[PDB]
Amino acid sequence: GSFVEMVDNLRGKSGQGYYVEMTVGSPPQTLNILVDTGSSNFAVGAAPHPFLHRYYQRQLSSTYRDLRKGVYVPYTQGKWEGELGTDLVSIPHGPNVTVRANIAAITESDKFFINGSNWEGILGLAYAEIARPDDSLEPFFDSLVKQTHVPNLFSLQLCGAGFPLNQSEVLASVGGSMIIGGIDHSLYTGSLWYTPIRREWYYEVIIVRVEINGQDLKMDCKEYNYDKSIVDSGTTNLRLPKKVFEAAVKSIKAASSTEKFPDGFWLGEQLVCWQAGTTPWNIFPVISLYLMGEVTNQSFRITILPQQYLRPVEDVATSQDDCYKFAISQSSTGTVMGAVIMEGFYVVFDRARKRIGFAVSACHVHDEFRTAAVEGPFVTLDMEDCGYNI
Numbered sequence: 001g002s003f004v005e006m007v008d009n010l011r012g013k014s015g016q017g018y019y020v021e022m023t024v025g026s027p028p029q030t031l032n033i034l035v036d037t038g039s040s041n042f043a044v045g046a047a048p049h050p051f052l053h054r055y056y057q058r059q060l061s062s063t064y065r066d067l068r069k070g071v072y073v074p075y076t077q078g079k080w081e082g083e084l085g086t087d088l089v090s091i092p093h094g095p096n097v098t099v100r101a102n103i104a105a106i107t108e109s110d111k112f113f114i115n116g117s118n119w120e121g122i123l124g125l126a127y128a129e130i131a132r133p134d135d136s137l138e139p140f141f142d143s144l145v146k147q148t149h150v151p152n153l154f155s156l157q158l159c160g161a162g163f164p165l166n167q168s169e170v171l172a173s174v175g176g177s178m179i180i181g182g183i184d185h186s187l188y189t190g191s192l193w194y195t196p197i198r199r200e201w202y203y204e205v206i207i208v209r210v211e212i213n214g215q216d217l218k219m220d221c222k223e224y225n226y227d228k229s230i231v232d233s234g235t236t237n238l239r240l241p242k243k244v245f246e247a248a249v250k251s252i253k254a255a256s257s258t259e260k261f262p263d264g265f266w267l268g269e270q271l272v273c274w275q276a277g278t279t280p281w282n283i284f285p286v287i288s289l290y291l292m293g294e295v296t297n298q299s300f301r302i303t304i305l306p307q308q309y310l311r312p313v314e315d316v317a318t319s320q321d322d323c324y325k326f327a328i329s330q331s332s333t334g335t336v337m338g339a340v341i342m343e344g345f346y347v348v349f350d351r352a353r354k355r356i357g358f359a360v361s362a363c364h365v366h367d368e369f370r371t372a373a374v375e376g377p378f379v380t381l382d383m384e385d386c387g388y389n390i
């Protein structure tokens with residue numbers, strides 16, 4: 001590992017998001033910021049809110065510049081409205097550089113901030129095409145690269161604990177690493193396999209085959225990417241297009257049929273619990289997603305365990321039982337490879353070479369019998385046809 005200064009700089013968990021510490025303004029104002037590869041705006045709370053114990057105070061920054069323009073971002077989940085401006089930004093546990101970046105000062109929000117998450121803003125790491133108001137508002141990473149010598153690449157290791165973390169624990173625990181400008185080899189095992197970034201807006205990729213315990217889901221691969229497939233640290237679950245979700249759940253139910261679970265569990269709403277240490281991991285299937293490779297007619301696969309798609313949650317009775325929620329749900333906006341999926345791998349966002357790399361994470365949760373995996377190559381034809389076109 002050659003980036004020790006950035007190793008272990010993240011905190012959080014899949015259900016509330018992973019964040020990195022940043023500073024904005026002069027003198028520096030420290031804020032915790034949600035790492036979101038699923039959007040492209042850098043925005044921070046800039047006014048009191050019930051769930052924030054601190055926020056950006058523009059009047060106290062000598063380097064603050066007002067862009068005299070409003071901005072509104074309606075995400076799938078929540079929304080915020082704010083005022084645009086620029087200011088000096090740094091990442092304490094990151095590259096030792098300071099850059100002038102666009103900042104949306106949030107003045108109003110609805111279902112955006114999360115009670116107890118410990119973050120006060122969001123860092124959209126995707127491309128300008130999806131930035132609000134429009135693509136003229138340069139994203140943070142683009143500014144960082146244009147203004148410094150930092151290589152055009154970042155990598156993420158999100159570390160799920162494998163069990164519930166209470167308020168005190170989640171504040172003291174290391175949640176992972178965000179390596180800005182490089183790849184740290186201590187964060188993964190095995191080889192890195194790369195899939196092309198189909199188009200630069202979201203970090204869009206193409207899934208060409210799906211297996212549940214090795215059994216082909218057997219759908220037209222176009223269905224897997226309808227209307228797109230993205231890698232999104234800003235979403236907890238693996239979200240799947242309606243028809244794919246229905247087929248996946250049917251197959252996962254069949255594989256785990258030795259135990260019956262309530263509909264509320266499969267809807268991702270209610271938790272299921274087992275006596276301490278008795279979670280029957282072995283009855284649940286592994287899930288493999290084959291992604292387009294960099295070489296013609298070649299693909300590779302990433303395999304996740306139920307230790308990834310079953311999200312640890314504290315029992316309503318704070319008992320000693322081990323409980324979880326099903327972290328796979330349906331989408332009407334394409335496949336979303338969220339945090340629970342990223343927790344199994346070290347993910348390299350190689351913007352310079354327009355590709356995304358995957359490798360088994362040194363911190364993924366597993367058991368003595370199975371492990372997550374990244375394997376290849378496989379001969380796969382007409383993969384271009386797996387991509388969707390409106």
Ligand SMILES: CCCN(CCC)C(=O)c1cc(C)cc(C(=O)N[C@@H](Cc2cc(F)cc(F)c2)[C@H](O)[C@H]2C[C@@H](Oc3ccccc3)CN2)c1
Pocket residue numbers: 014015016017034036037038039040073074075076077078079111112113114130232234235236237
């Ligand atoms: C992460 C903590 C738990 N959580 C949020 C609270 C329930 C989710 O799992 C979740 C669930 C859904 C169904 C959507 C989004 C969602 O919209 N996430 C976006 C980021 C985000 C928004 C928010 F309000 C609170 C957050 F904690 C995180 C991300 O950019 C998604 C949205 C879409 O891309 C865009 C849509 C519109 C504009 C720009 C990007 C694909 N990436 C997030």
